[PDB]
C-alpha cells in the first residue's frame, strides 16, 4: 500500500533474483581464475554481462521509490545502495570505450614483458623481473628491471590512462560527484545518522592529520634504513638524500619487507622466519590453512565449511593451466566460500593465509545479512580484519606455541626489536607510499595536476612525502603510477592506508579483551573467546550500520586514530631514536642518482 511496503517487496524480489545471478557470475569468474581459457574468458564475460545488465535495470527500478518517504533505516540503506548506475550513466559509446580502455590496460599490465639486455630472456612481472626486485642486491639489475618495466609497460598506459581519467571523471560528474577521486571517497560517506555521519572530504582531512602524526616514526625508519643501505651500497646513496626507488625490495617500494636481510638490527640472534622449520616438519599448504582454521577456532570462530576445503584452490595447479595467484578470498554467495592462493611453504604465505581466512571469516559472519548489506563497513574494514590476523600470527609467541619457533628461545630485547623492525618494514613502509599514490590520483582526478606535469609532480611527491627519488629522469611519456597493479586496473588505494589505521584500534581493543600484558606489539589473541566475541559483534553487522558504530562495537570510539599504531611501534620508535641520535632524520629532495 504505502511506498515503503512496495520498496520492501521490490527489495525482496531483487534479493532472490540477485542470489542466483551473483552465483552464476562468481562461479564463471572462479572457473576462469582457475582455468584461464579463451572459453572461460567468454563465459566469464557473458555471466558478468547478464549480471551488469540486471543491475542497470534494477537501479532504474529502485530509483522509482523515493528515499524521502521511507523511515526504516535498513531498507533506506539497501535502496540507496541500489540507486546508483555507475558507468551506466554514460552513453553506450562512452561506456564501451571505457570498458575497452580498462581491458587494454589490464592486459598490458598482465602481459607486459621486457628482455634482459643480457641475452634476451624476456621476463614478465610474474616470477622473474619480480624475483629480481625481491632478491637481487646488484644495483644494476634492480635499476634495469625498474626502468625497463616503467618504460616498456608504463609508456603504453599513458594515453590510455589520460582517456581513462577523462571518461571516468565524466562518469563521476554524471553521478553528481565532483570528480572520480571524490567518487571513490564516497565509500566512507555516512548520511542521515546523527553523531555518526561522515563526509567525503572529512576523509581528506583525517588521512592528512593521521599522516602528520605518522611522519616522525617513518622519518626515523627512513633514516635507519638509509644508514644500513648506505653501508651496503656506498657509492650509490647520499647520507642526506632520498632512497633510490629501485632499491626498495619490490617493483615500486610498496613494502620494505625484502630489505630485512640488509637492515635487521641484531643479525646474530634467531631471525624470525619459519620458512625452514615448516620445510623440516614437512608442512604443505593443507597444514598451513589447517593451522589458520585452528587459530580462528581457538578464538570462538567457526571452522571452515567443508565446501571451503573441497572447492578452494590452495596450491598452484599441479598440471592445470595458468590460474591467477593473487591471494583472494571469495564470497560467491549461497554459503559458498573459497580461497585462491598459490601457497608456498614459507612464512609469508603462512601469514597471507591467516589474512585471507579472516576475510572469509568476515564474509561468513555477515552472511545472514541482506545481500545488499553483505560487506565490510567501509572499503577498509575488510582489509584491517585481514591484517590483525597476521599481526597476531607473526608474534614470536604464536610461532612458539605452533611449534614453528624453538620453545627454548628467549623473547629478549633484541629479538623483539628485530620483529618490530620487520613488522615496520612491511606495515609502516607502505603508509607514505599508499597515501602519496592516492593523493596523486585524487589530484589528477580533481584536475589540480595538468597532463604536461603528470609525472614531474609524481616524482616531486615521491621525494617530498615518501623520501624516495627516481634513479632515471622520466619525461611525461612515462606513466609510473599505472605501472602498479591497482592503478592500471581501476582500484582505490586509500583502503590500505585506512586498513592500517583501523587494524591497530581493533587489535588494541581485542588485546585488551584478551588480557594481554606488555607492549601492544607482542600481543597474541589466540585462546581468548572474549576477543572473538567482541570481534563478531562487529563482523556480523556487515554494513547494516555505519562503520562509525561497528567501530564503537569494538574499540568504543568512532574515529580513525593512529595512536594505537604508534603504541604498537613505540619500542621501535625509541630504539630508532637512539640509533639515529647522531644521524640525519629526514631527507633532501634535491639529490638524485643521476645528478652529479
Amino acid at each position: 500500500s504505502t511506498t515503503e511496503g512496495q520498496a520492501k517487496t521490490f527489495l525482496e524480489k531483487f534479493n532472490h533474483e540477485a542470489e542466483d545471478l551473483s552465483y552464476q557470475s562468481s562461479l564463471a569468474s572462479w572457473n576462469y581464475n582457475t582455468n584461464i581459457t579463451d572459453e572461460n574468458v567468454q563465459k566469464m564475460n557473458e555471466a558478468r554481462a547478464k549480471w551488469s545488465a540486471f543491475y542497470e535495470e534494477q537501479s532504474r527500478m529502485a530509483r522509482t521509490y523515493s528515499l524521502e518517504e521511507i523511515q526504516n533505516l535498513t531498507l533506506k540503506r539497501q535502496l540507496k545502495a541500489l540507486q546508483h548506475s555507475g558507468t551506466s550513466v554514460l552513453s553506450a559509446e562512452k561506456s564501451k570505450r571505457l570498458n575497452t580502455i580498462l581491458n587494454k590496460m589490464s592486459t598490458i599490465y598482465s602481459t607486459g614483458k621486457v628482455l634482459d639486455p643480457n641475452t634476451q630472456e624476456c621476463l614478465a612481472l610474474e616470477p622473474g623481473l619480480d624475483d629480481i626486485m625481491e632478491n637481487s642486491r646488484d644495483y644494476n639489475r634492480r635499476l634495469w628491471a625498474w626502468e625497463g618495466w616503467r618504460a616498456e609497460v608504463g609508456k603504453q598506459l599513458r594515453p590510455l590512462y589520460e582517456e581513462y581519467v577523462v571518461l571516468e571523471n565524466e562518469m563521476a560528474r554524471a553521478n553528481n560527484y565532483e570528480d572520480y577521486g571524490d567518487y571513490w571517497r564516497g565509500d566512507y560517506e555516512v548520511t542521515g545518522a546523527g553523531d555518526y555521519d561522515y563526509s567525503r572530504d572529512q576523509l581528506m582531512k583525517d588521512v592528512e592529520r593521521t599522516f602528520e602524526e605518522i611522519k616522525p616514526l617513518y622519518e626515523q625508519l627512513h633514516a635507519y634504513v638509509r644508514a644500513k643501505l648506505m653501508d651496503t651500497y656506498p657509492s650509490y646513496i647520499s647520507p642526506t638524500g632520498c632512497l633510490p626507488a629501485h632499491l626498495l625490495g619490490d617493483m615500486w617500494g610498496r613494502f620494505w619487507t625484502n630489505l630485512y636481510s640488509l637492515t635487521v638490527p641484531f643479525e646474530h640472534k634467531p631471525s624470525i622466519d619459519v620458512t625452514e622449520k615448516m620445510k623440516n616438519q614437512s608442512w604443505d599448504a593443507e597444514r598451513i590453512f589447517k593451522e589458520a582454521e585452528k587459530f580462528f577456532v581457538s578464538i570462538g570462530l567457526p571452522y571452515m565449511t567443508q565446501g571451503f576445503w573441497d572447492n578452494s584452490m590452495l596450491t598452484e595447479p599441479g598440471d592445470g593451466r595458468k590460474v591467477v595467484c593473487h591471494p583472494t578470498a571469495w564470497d560467491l554467495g549461497k554459503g559458498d566460500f573459497r580461497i585462491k592462493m598459490c601457497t608456498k611453504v614459507t612464512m609469508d604465505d603462512f601469514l597471507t593465509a591467516h589474512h585471507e581466512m579472516g576475510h572469509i571469516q568476515y564474509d561468513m559472519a555477515y552472511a545472514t545479512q541482506p545481500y545488499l548489506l553483505r560487506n565490510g563497513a567501509n572499503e577498509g574494514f575488510h582489509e584491517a580484519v585481514g591484517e590483525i590476523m597476521s599481526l597476531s600470527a607473526a608474534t614470536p609467541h604464536y610461532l612458539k606455541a605452533l611449534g614453528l619457533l624453538a620453545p627454548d628461545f628467549y623473547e629478549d630485547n633484541e629479538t623483539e626489536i628485530n620483529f618490530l623492525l620487520k613488522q615496520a618494514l612491511t606495515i609502516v613502509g607502505t603508509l607514505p607510499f599508499t597515501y602519496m599514490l592516492e593523493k596523486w590520483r585524487w589530484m589528477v582526478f580533481k584536475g589540480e595536476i595538468p597532463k604536461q606535469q603528470w609525472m614531474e609532480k609524481w616524482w616531486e611527491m615521491k621525494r617530498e612525502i615518501v623520501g624516495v627519488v627516481e634513479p632515471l629522469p622520466h619525461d611525461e611519456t612515462y606513466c609510473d603510477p599505472a605501472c602498479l597493479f591497482h592503478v592500471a586496473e581501476d582500484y582505490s588505494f586509500i583502503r590500505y592506508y585506512t586498513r592500517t589505521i583501523y587494524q591497530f584500534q581493533f587489535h588494541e581493543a581485542l588485546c585488551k579483551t584478551a588480557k594481554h600484558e606488555g607492549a601492544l606489539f607482542k600481543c597474541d589473541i589466540s585462546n581468548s573467546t572474549e576477543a572473538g566475541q567482541r570481534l563478531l559483534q562487529m563482523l556480523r553487522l556487515g554494513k547494516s550500520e555505519p562503520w562509525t558504530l561497528a567501530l564503537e562495537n569494538i574499540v568504543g570510539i568512532k574515529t580513525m586514530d593512529v595512536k594505537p599504531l604508534l603504541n604498537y611501534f613505540e619500542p621501535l620508535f625509541t630504539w630508532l631514536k637512539e640509533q639515529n641520535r647522531n644521524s640525519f632524520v629526514g631527507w633532501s629532495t634535491e639529490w638524485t642518482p643521476y645528478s652529479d
Binding site: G5, Q6, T9, F10, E12, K13, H16, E17, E19, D20, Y23, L27, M61, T64, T305, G307, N311, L332, K334, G335, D336, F337, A367
Partner: protein, 195 residues
C-alpha cells in the same frame, strides 16, 4: 494387517515444490515408526507432539504425510509458530501441531551443476496461510496501485520463484527433503497403529 506405504513417501524419486506441497493419506495399515527413527539417516527428526520412541505403541484414525523440498536454513521454519517465507506463504504448521517434522539433506539428488531449478517457492502473498493451507495460484502479485493485466512489470511480480540448487552451495542453501507426519485423533476408530 498391511504395511503403511511410507516407502513411496520418503523414498520418492521426486518431491514437490513447497508451495504445492504433496499430501498422502495413511489409513488401514500398521506402521513401525521406530525404524524411521533408528534409520539415523536424517538431519532433523523433531516431534512436536508424541515421543518418536513411542509411536510404535499408539493408534490413530488417520496419518497425513506432507512432503516437499526447501533450503536447509528454511527447515527451522517447518515448526509451530514460525515466521518467514516458508511458514507464512508456503507451509504453515498450526500452533497445536501434534506430529513430527523429518528432513534430510538431498544434495546428491536435487542439485546439479548448471542449476536444478525444478523446485519452487512462493515469495509474495496478500496474507499469511492458514494452518495446512495450500495455495498454488500463479496470479501476478500487485505490489503497487496499477493493475498488472497478468503480465510482470513495474510493481508486478510473478508470485512463485525457483530454488537454484548447485552442488557447490552452502549447507544453508542446499536442498533438504521434508516430510511432516500429522496424527489425527477423532472418535472414529483407529486404522493406523504401531507394531
Amino acid at each position: 494387517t498391511n504395511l503403511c506405504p511410507f516407502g513411496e513417501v520418503f523414498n520418492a524419486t521426486t518431491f514437490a515444490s513447497v508451495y504445492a506441497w504433496n499430501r498422502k493419506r495413511i489409513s488401514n495399515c500398521v506402521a513401525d515408526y521406530s525404524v524411521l527413527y533408528n534409520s539415523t539417516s536424517f538431519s532433523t527428526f523433531k516431534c512436536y507432539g508424541v515421543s518418536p520412541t513411542k509411536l510404535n505403541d499408539l493408534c490413530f484414525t488417520n496419518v497425513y504425510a506432507d512432503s516437499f523440498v526447501i533450503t536447509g536454513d528454511e527447515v527451522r521454519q517447518i515448526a509451530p509458530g514460525q515466521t518467514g517465507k516458508i511458514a507464512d506463504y508456503n507451509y504453515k504448521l498450526p500452533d497445536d501441531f501434534t506430529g513430527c517434522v523429518i528432513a534430510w539433506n538431498s544434495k546428491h539428488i536435487d542439485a546439479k551443476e548448471g542449476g536444478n531449478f525444478n523446485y519452487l517457492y512462493r515469495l509474495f502473498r496478500k496474507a499469511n496461510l492458514k494452518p495446512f493451507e495450500r495455495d498454488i495460484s500463479t496470479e501476478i502479485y500487485q505490489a503497487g496501485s496499477k493493475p498488472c493485466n497478468g503480465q510482470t512489470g513495474l510493481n508486478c511480480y510473478y508470485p512463485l520463484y525457483r530454488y537454484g540448487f548447485y552442488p557447490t552451495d552452502g549447507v544453508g542453501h542446499q536442498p533438504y527433503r521434508v516430510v511432516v507426519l500429522s496424527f489425527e485423533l477423532l472418535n472414529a476408530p483407529a486404522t493406523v497403529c504401531g507394531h
